[PDB]
Nucleic acid binder design. Sequence first.
RNA 1: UAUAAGAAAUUAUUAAGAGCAAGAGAAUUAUUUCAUUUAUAGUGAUUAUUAAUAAACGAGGAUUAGGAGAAAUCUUAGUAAUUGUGAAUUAAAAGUAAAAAUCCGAUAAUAAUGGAAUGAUAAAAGCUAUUUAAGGUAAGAUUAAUAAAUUUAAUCCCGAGAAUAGAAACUCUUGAAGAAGUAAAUUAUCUACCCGUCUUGAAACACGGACCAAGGAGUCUAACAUGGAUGCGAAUGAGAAUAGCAGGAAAGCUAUAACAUGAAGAGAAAACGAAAAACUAUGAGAGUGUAGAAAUACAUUUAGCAAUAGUAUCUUUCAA
RNA 2: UUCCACCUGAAUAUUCCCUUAGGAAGGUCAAAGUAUUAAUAGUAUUGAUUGGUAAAGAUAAUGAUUAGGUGU
RNA 3: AUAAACAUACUUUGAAUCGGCCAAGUCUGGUAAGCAGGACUGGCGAUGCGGGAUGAACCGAACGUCGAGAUAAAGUGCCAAA
RNA 4: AAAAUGAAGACAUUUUAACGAGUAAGGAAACGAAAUGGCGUAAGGACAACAAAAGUAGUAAAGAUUUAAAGUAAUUUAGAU
Lengths: 167, 115, 97
Amino acid sequence: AIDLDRHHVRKHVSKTARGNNAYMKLLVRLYGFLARRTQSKFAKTILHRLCLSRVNRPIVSTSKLACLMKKHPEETAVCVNTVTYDSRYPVPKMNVCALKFTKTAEAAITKAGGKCLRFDELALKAPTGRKTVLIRGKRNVREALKHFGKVCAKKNPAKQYKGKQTK
Amino acid sequence: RLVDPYVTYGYPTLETVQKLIYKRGALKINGNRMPITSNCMIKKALGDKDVVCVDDLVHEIYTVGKHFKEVNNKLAPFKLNGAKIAEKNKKIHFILGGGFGNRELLINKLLANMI
Amino acid sequence: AMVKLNPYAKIASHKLAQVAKAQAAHKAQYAAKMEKILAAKKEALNQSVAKRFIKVKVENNLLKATVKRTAKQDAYMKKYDGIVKANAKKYAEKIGF
RNA sequence: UAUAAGAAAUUAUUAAGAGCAAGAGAAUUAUUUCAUUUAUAGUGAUUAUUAAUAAACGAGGAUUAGGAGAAAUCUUAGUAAUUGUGAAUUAAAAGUAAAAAUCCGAUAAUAAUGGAAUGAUAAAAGCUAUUUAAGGUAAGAUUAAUAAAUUUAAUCCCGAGAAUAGAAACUCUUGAAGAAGUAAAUUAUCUACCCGUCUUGAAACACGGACCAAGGAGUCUAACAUGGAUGCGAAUGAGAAUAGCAGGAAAGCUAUAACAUGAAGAGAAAACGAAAAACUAUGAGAGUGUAGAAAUACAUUUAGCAAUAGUAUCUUUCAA
RNA sequence: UUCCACCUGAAUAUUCCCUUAGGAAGGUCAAAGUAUUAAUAGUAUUGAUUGGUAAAGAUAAUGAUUAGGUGU
RNA sequence: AUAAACAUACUUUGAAUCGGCCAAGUCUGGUAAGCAGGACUGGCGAUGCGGGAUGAACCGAACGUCGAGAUAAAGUGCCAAA
RNA sequence: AAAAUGAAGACAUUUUAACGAGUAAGGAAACGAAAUGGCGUAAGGACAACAAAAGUAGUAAAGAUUUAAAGUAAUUUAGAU
């Protein structure tokens, strides 16, 4: 035989739209074609982020979009995730491209004079990506991450799944 | 020397280098072991290192030029045939009439039957 | 396939042929010579065992010349023979320790 | 619709005729390989041409009576110091120091002739012919100076690139009177200990198993967590009970609603309850120019999300 | 303790237990999911070190042991 | 110096397991043990194939289904290929 | 694994390269370039002659016995009785 360090196993990268969503399947078809032909790292990035699981595509609120678009007035924020609404703070005028807009987030963005785009329109308008800002939400804000580990640990304790007689 | 029991080695002649490269030569292109078939693929893989033909490849290996490391690392390890390893057996040094160890220029007789 | 990989194969094959053709002819034009020197030392043998072979005093120069050379080259034959004798003595002393 | 392709059917001749499959060849080949032969820049040894000195060694040495050998003409035989061999060394002749054979070293490569396994059929970065000439580094050849030279000069030869013209479509045998393949039975060579299980280890002198059919063993309810697909999103659920609708309905539809989880956290508790509209580092992406030149590789402008780490600041606690 | 094929593929260390025919933390392993990535090494070389094993010693320190001279 | 992009860093969830056994240019107790217990590595367990007649561990070498060749351990009087 | 192509072909595409032993154990379903691929038992909701008589069946169902074919395999298909 041959002395290989390890044998061939599937590479743990997703390369298609998870699930049976007909529209998300077409979006992966559109951007897998765009990245293969245009050879643009922007389409490669969007295609890769379209194939992540739901937990790995965290939301971005309108407050975060406003802060990141402050010094980018004439730009199109591109976040591959759902865009929620932060009712604590106002929404300025900006153009956002996202997979899905919350009913209140879409109204707030529109009522301020902005625009709510989808990814098909963005590819039609800015295929390689020229006036866009790539944005992703925070991953560590999940509450599940608090209980990972050993709660007896001296340095970074876990958070003790509550149960029988938890004080 | 540390791995002496598991290998036999020696000093090749120029004709030995040529036959190994021409018959058993290969390159690692895109992670694929593509056998040598034209100068275009050798130019594509090693054009940056000023090796644009197979005879540049042979000369660099034989004389150990400045870009030996890059050229040698692109060359896949040759897969040889079988041949009479030793007189007694391969459990003793070639000095004792065995199979492993440093054969010096006598390694070309073995390579002749294995290429 | 060799031409495709090594276009220099045509230059070093025709030129290799001309080396081969002539080199073969040198064998022929050394056998014709070594036919004379081998048929001039027969008529120095069957002419020496025959009559003279006490009457052991046989002529010193029964061997006859077959290839003619100038006087300058004759001096070089004895110059060469002196050198090869020195080389044989040079080597024998060395390995004799 | 315009042009070749130009099908089927027909006319005259005969070197007069399918498809498929199996086998044997033919010509040119691809990958691998078997057998035989052939050259491998040994300056190694022998391979009858004469003579001399030898370091050593045994014998011999001075009339045909009986013979061996050869058609020789020349040797052999045995009944007081002439001579024989000779490692090695030397002289003369020959020798430009590559023949053939054997041995000793070095190697195994190019080629040719016959096959074998899996294929292919096509024309060339095939091969061949004509033109000019990059080249021939001991060695393509002939010459001269000289020479333990892979040292020099000359003119003859051949000739890579390229331009221009050339050429491949075949034979035989067997098969619905049963081909090739496949299957069953028998024979022959090689091959094969009883399954399941505990065990370091069972074919085991360890246990269960006489045989067959049917039945036969990770399921259901409830709480939590991770995770992949789904809806909505500072909210989600409200098939909480329950109340209405059409239809007659254990199904379906509708109820601004108590509550559950979450949006705020720390403290035993009293009492409290979050910004310097943040900072630093590396990091995703977007352009312009040049060049290789096929893709691609550098120079430079810009943005700096996620993540990790470290900082200020703020709520609570004796203590973060 | 009931179907097939394919891929990866182990363990007898350590801590605690009324523990010793058994558990939990942990190591080995599998499957899911990520990050352009101060985030490669069961290797050799050069350079500065660490150690007290094999060996060595035995009027060199602590011990063990056979004798022979010289002096009081 | 050499190697390394199906590299590297992992995160989460979880299975089985912690009766072991053998070898040795190794050690300790023992007269000794196919005994008892350890250091380092390789194996058997979990493993078939060629050889040692036979064998869990020895030697060569680890396995998709086949054809052709060159081999390894080891062998060439017959069983038995040479 | 990487490149190419990609609304539907089809054989779960095309090419190149590397690999394939294995007890305990793991790899749920779905996921077009598919985050392993499939066979079988029974029941429920659909689909099954697209032109207004729409899967098979007394011109012989299910079952049983065998003969052959397809599949690496689980199994499936057809003939005869």
